[PDB]
Design a binder for these strands. Structure first.
Ligand SMILES: Nc1ncnc2c1ncn2[C@@H]1O[C@H](COP(=O)(O)OP(=O)(O)OP(O)(O)=S)[C@@H](O)[C@H]1O
Ligand SMILES: [Mg+2]
Ligand SMILES: [Zn+2]
Ligand SMILES: [Zn+2]
Lengths: 647, 487
DNA sequence: GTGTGTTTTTTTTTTTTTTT
DNA sequence: CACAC
């Protein structure tokens, strides 16, 4: 038998108070939610977001004038699933008529409604039929409570406190909770059936079957009154036109690194989003997701094998990301702060010296634009440097400041195919394609195999990588700016040894880079002293020794690139003449130098100079490519060339 | 039409009066095309002319643009219903095609077998149905709707036989009856159709005597220029029926139009328990590949009569690359090549491009690869797209031990453009030795012994060792290539 | 009403072995 | 184990 228990919740009074709340709530037009329901009747909205703050304020109001509430905010945090249906029924009861001439060209559900109504009425005179969910063209979600900063938050409002995956104890099942975490895998959008709308071959009847079990069985038997009384035993035909479907996505959110105790392994949680909340998440999202925590069952035969040990998931209800006014602000910064010098230090405020490398980083971040072909607007630099020089910190800073910026080591990109056997998905990404409209910071570029060598090559002269798993020859676009941080082999760099002999990279690939710098450390009396002072101050204050202008936000570079991408600074005829004689004299001095053969001037160096000038004018308004621009670009190029010949 | 409150007769009449009395001038004025001054291509009854062309050619399909229904006045709601209810609309569409064709045959006195027209099934392929919708934006209200999509196909399944008309034979009296099959359900007869036997449960399906149609699921991939950069392009399952089979090889960038439909998947094969996922597909009704002549012979004789045809062709080989006159001449000669003398003589030219690393070495390679009809560009060291040699691999799906061809084979007649020729592996160096000397590739592995005729042309380009080629040093000491292969 | 049928897996990771 | 064949 089924024993009985007594619980003080009073669903009937709660539903009546819910109706009163919806009808008689006016936030500080008429009622806000009646306005939203009217808009839904106008087919202008199909997403009812029930804010907990509104319910709490309504309770606060009516408590002073009758206490006509049962702490609904605390009452629905215990079992939100039932209250979801309660809200749905309340909306249907108080659903306003449409107040707009909405075109009914596609009114298949309305057509079914009126057709079945007429069919029933033509015999009703004798001369619920529809599921409550089927008639709904809307979906209802819950917005969690905000911060209280009051005595009401007396450990209650579990949705206000962001939990972690490890903090989700089994007792929380059925509660409306929230977590803070990072996504790792998002599924595709799929149609999950809400109610099937079978139609019978004879007897003309259509029968609806609501399903929430993740798996069901067809009816295929005309149990309709006419068919049953005639014993025709008609089979039912599933009808997608009249059936109801919902967009569905299944995300797999992991816990943040800070939410993991020492010596432990981060956990994961599956999230089932549906309705209009689909496609609102990506794998690279760190979010605070609030939803209903439900025990997804092993319905079928596996339940018998396993037993009471069920699995859990979160029915998400709300998502909050964490991640020309600014345009006027960046002109203000341009006029006040000298971007060439100030933003150079801003890129690496904690790194002392190597300001010209920082300026090269600014130019790479800006990048040229020569999309027209007959080339490429990606600036690429390699930082061979010297072990012990803060190349890794520079790459980390670039990754943290460059939009779509990714960082990886030479030894860990590439791509993989059908990683999970179950779903058998297609064309998993990598690391190079992640920074498509971004920059890849390749540390340990020397310790990087021939496979990734050819991959990054194909990328750099193609802006696209490709894979040939089974002759599919599918390709993934990666127009990534290449930032390498190799180091000389056998440890410290040898100035006497040739630069290409000091690094185990092919000379052809190295020459195809637009620019390269030797930044090696040499023991001095003062530079080391000032660097030690800088590090000690950073240790003192957890902040840089601010002795100059230190802008923080990188959106200034974003404004510059977005503004000057369309501008496309047109090279002047004088610009072309000056760069052509520059190439002539550069090749002449390269030959007359023939001491290392890497100093030969190439048309690739001309392309690099052109794109550097394009980036220079790109940062400085439009069409700044002139004698001054090419002089600056040639000065930087010659400085880089002499860097290889340092000492 | 059930579920839409739309009469079939009015739609049929609308399309009927849209067939004739409709001119392409309606299309020219619908889009406000300024060049409406054309009369023969506009004021003529374009659909009537298409009917005449079909009658004189005996084809079945019809490539209809959806804009034409907007151009006509009475077929606006027809266009709306086609966008909303493609199945019934297309069915009556093709039925009206057949009826109008037989009526035209009767009226115009054009003598022809009416039974031949009636038996033949005629198709309509409505393209340009709507905007270039993104497959990522496939919200679930598009079920049973005609959808235009753009993308590049990944792969194609082989021909799949789906049973259209059943064939039951009475095992006790040898009575054979055929049952029409709709929605893939078996309406097997209760008893024998012949009265003298009428035995229940006496009918066995004769599988090879049934009627079968061709289904070919394709794997469409979202085009790179429309997919968001952060996420990989997604995939969809195209469905091809009764036509357009093998009309799209793998790797084709196409614009497809078809009805977006989904079907449930059984949770357990033995049971009828159905998973709530409803695997989706699209029933393709049209595909457009968005991507020999007497006048051509006249052009050939004109260019042949030109005195500077040698220099003209040499310049056309690499218009964007300067100098390299003799290089262009040699490449042109290789594209022509010697006569393949039979009785073996190669009748072909092998050319290598040594010298210091130059971008032009690859630029002219891409230019000639574009120029040559056959052959394929390949990086010898890389060989990422093609392995440069034919070998047998296990295809994963069905784990079949299938042979795949290299770049040398299938490049007969044409030029297989090689890059990084010096840096290629020694195994493929020996394979190149075989293909250049014996002109055939001999493979003996996994119980399979075969010889494949390659007969290809070689245009290789290898960079030298060190920073650049040394003119004082010989070619062998700088290119790092075996002397037999070099010679 | 007697008796069935699933759910149900071969990855990644070690260790060996032949070439390379 | 138990619901579906
Ligand atoms: N100019 C500098 N300013 C500030 N910190 C610096 C500077 N040079 C080195 N460092 C410090 O040196 C460390 C970073 O050095 P690394 O980048 O790891 O050396 P490395 O050359 O990359 O060696 P690897 O990793 O083998 S390539 C950090 O602790 C930095 O604080
Ligand atoms: Mg480092
Ligand atoms: Zn029935
Ligand atoms: Zn019989």
């Amino acid at each position: 038998a089924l024993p009985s228990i007594q619980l003080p919740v009073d669903y009937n009074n709660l539903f009546n108070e819910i109706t009163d709340f919806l009808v008689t709530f006016k936030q500080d037009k008429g009622p806000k939610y009646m306005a939203m329901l009217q808009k839904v009747a106008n087919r202008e909205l199909n997403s009812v977001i029930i804010d907990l703050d509104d319910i709490l304020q309504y309770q606060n109001e009516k408590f002073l004038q009758g206490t006509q509430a049962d702490d609904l905010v605390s009452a629905i945090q215990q079992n939100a699933n039932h209250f979801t249906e309660l809200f749905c029924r309340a909306i249907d009861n108080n659903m306003p008529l449409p107040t707009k001439e909405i075109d009914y060209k596609d009114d298949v559900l309305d057509v079914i409604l009126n057709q079945r109504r007429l069919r029933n009425e033509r015999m009703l005179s004798d001369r619920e039929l529809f599921p409550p969910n089927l008639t709904r063209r809307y979906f209802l979600y819950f917005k969690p409570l905000s911060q209280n900063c009051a005595r009401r938050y007396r450990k209650k409002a579990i949705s206000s406190k962001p939990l972690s995956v490890r903090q989700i104890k089994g007792d929380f099942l059925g509660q409306l909770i929230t977590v803070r975490g990072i996504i790792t895998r998002v599924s595709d959008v799929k149609p999950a059936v809400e109610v099937i709308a079978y139609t019978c071959d004879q007897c003309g009847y259509e029968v609806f079957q609501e399903v929430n079990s993740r798996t069901f069985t067809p009816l295929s038997e005309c149990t309709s009154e006419e068919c049953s009384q005639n014993q025709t035993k008609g089979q039912l035909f599933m009808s997608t036109r009249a059936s109801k479907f919902s967009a569905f996505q299944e995300c797999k959110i992991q816990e943040l690194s800070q939410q993991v105790p020492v010596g432990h392994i981060p956990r994961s949680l599956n999230i089932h989003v549906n309705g209009t909340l689909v496609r609102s998440l990506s794998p690279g999202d760190i979010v605070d997701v609030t939803g209903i925590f439900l025990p997804a069952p092993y319905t079928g035969f596996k339940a018998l094998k396993a037993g009471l040990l069920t699995e859990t998931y979160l029915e998400a209800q709300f998502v909050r990301q964490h991640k020309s006014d600014v345009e006027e602000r960046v002109m203000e910064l341009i006029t006040s702060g000298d971007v060439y010098n100030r933003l150079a230090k801003s890129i690496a405020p904690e790194i002392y010296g190597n300001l010209d490398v920082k300026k090269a980083l600014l130019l790479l971040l800006v990048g040229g634009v020569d999309k027209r072909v007959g080339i490429r607007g990606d600036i690429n630099v390699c930082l061979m440097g010297d072990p012990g020089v803060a190349k890794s910190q520079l790459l980390k800073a670039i990754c943290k400041i460059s939009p779509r910026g990714v960082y990886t080591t030479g030894k860990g990109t590439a791509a993989v195919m059908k990683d999970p056997v179950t779903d058998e998905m297609i064309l998993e990404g990598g690391a190079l394609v992640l920074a498509d409209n971004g920059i890849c910071c390749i540390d340990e570029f020397d310790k990087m195999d021939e496979s990734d060598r050819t991959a990054i090559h194909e990328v750099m002269e193609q802006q696209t990588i490709s894979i040939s798993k089974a002759g599919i020859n599918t390709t993934l676009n990666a127009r990534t700016s290449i930032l390498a941080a190799a180091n000389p082999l056998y440890g410290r760099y040898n100035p006497r040894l040739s630069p290409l002999d000091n690094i185990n990279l092919p000379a052809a690939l190295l020459s195809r880079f637009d620019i390269l710098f030797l930044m090696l450390d040499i023991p001095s009396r003062d530079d080391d002293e000032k660097l030690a002072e800088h590090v000690t101050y950073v240790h003192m204050h957890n902040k840089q020794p601010d002795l100059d202008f230190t802008p923080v936000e990188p959106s200034k570079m974003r404004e510059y690139i977005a503004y000057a991408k369309t501008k496309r600074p047109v090279m002047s005829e004088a610009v072309n003449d000056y760069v052509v004689q520059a190439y002539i004299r550069l090749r002449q001095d390269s030959k007359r130098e023939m001491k290392f053969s890497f100093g030969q001037a190439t048309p690739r160096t001309l392309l690099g100079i052109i794109r550097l000038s394009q980036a220079l004018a790109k940062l400085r308004l439009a069409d700044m490519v002139d004698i001054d621009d090419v002089e600056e670009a040639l000065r930087l190029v010659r400085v880089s060339k002499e860097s290889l010949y340092q000492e | 039409i059930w579920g839409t409150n739309v009469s079939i007769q009015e739609c049929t009449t609308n399309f009927r009066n849209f067939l004739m009395s409709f001119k392409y001038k309606f299309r020219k004025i619908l889009d406000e095309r300024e060049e409406f001054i054309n009369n023969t291509t506009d004021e003529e009854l374009y659909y009537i002319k298409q009917l005449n062309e079909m009658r004189e050619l005996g084809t079945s399909n019809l490539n209809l643009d959806a804009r034409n229904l907007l151009a006509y006045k009475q077929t606006e709601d027809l266009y709306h219903q086609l966008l909303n209810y493609p199945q019934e609309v297309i069915s009556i569409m093709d039925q009206t095609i057949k009826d109008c064709m037989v009526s035209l045959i009767v009226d115009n006195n054009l003598d022809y077998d009416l039974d031949e027209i009636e038996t033949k099934f005629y198709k309509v392929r409505p393209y340009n149905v709507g905007s270039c919708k993104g497959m990522r934006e496939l919200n679930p209200n598009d079920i049973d709707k005609l959808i235009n999509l753009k993308g590049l196909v990944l792969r194609s399944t082989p021909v799949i036989p789906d049973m259209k008309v059943a064939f039951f034979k009475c095992n006790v009296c040898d009575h054979t009856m055929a049952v029409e099959i709709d929605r893939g359900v078996i309406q097997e007869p209760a008893r024998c159709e012949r009265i003298d036997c009428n035995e229940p449960n006496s009918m066995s399906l004769i599988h090879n005597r049934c009627s079968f149609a061709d289904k070919q699921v394709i794997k469409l991939q979202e085009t790179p220029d429309f997919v968001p950069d952060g996420q990989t392009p997604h995939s969809i399952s195209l469905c091809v029926y009764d036509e357009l089979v093998d009309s799209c090889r793998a790797g084709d960038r196409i614009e497809v139009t078809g009805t977006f439909r989904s079907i449930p998947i059984r949770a357990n094969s033995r049971q009828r328990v159905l998973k709530s996922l409803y695997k989706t597909y699209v029933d393709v009704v049209h595909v457009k590949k968005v991507s020999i002549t007497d006048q051509d012979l006249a052009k050939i004789r004109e260019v042949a009569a030109r005195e500077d045809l040698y220099s003209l062709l040499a310049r056309s080989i690499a218009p964007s690359i300067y100098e390299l006159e003799d290089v262009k001449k040699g490449i042109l000669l290789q594209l022509f090549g010697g006569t393949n003398k039979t009785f073996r003589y190669r009748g072909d030219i092998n050319i290598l491009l040594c010298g210091d690393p130059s971008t032009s070495k690859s630029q002219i390679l891409q230019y000639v690869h574009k120029i040559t009809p056959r052959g394929v560009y390949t990086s010898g060291k890389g060989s990422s797209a093609v392995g440069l040699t034919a070998y047998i691999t296990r295809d994963v799906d069905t784990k079949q031990l299938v042979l795949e061809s290299g770049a040398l084979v299938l490049s007969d007649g044409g030029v297989c453009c090689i890059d990084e020729f010096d840096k290629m592996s020694d195994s493929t160096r020996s394979v190149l030795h075989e293909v250049m000397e014996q002109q055939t590739i001999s493979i003996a592995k996994a119980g399979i012994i075969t010889t494949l005729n390659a007969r290809s042309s070689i245009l290789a380009s290898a960079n030298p060792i060190g920073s650049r080629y040394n003119p004082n040093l010989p070619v062998t000491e700088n290119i790092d290539l075996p002397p037999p292969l070099l010679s």
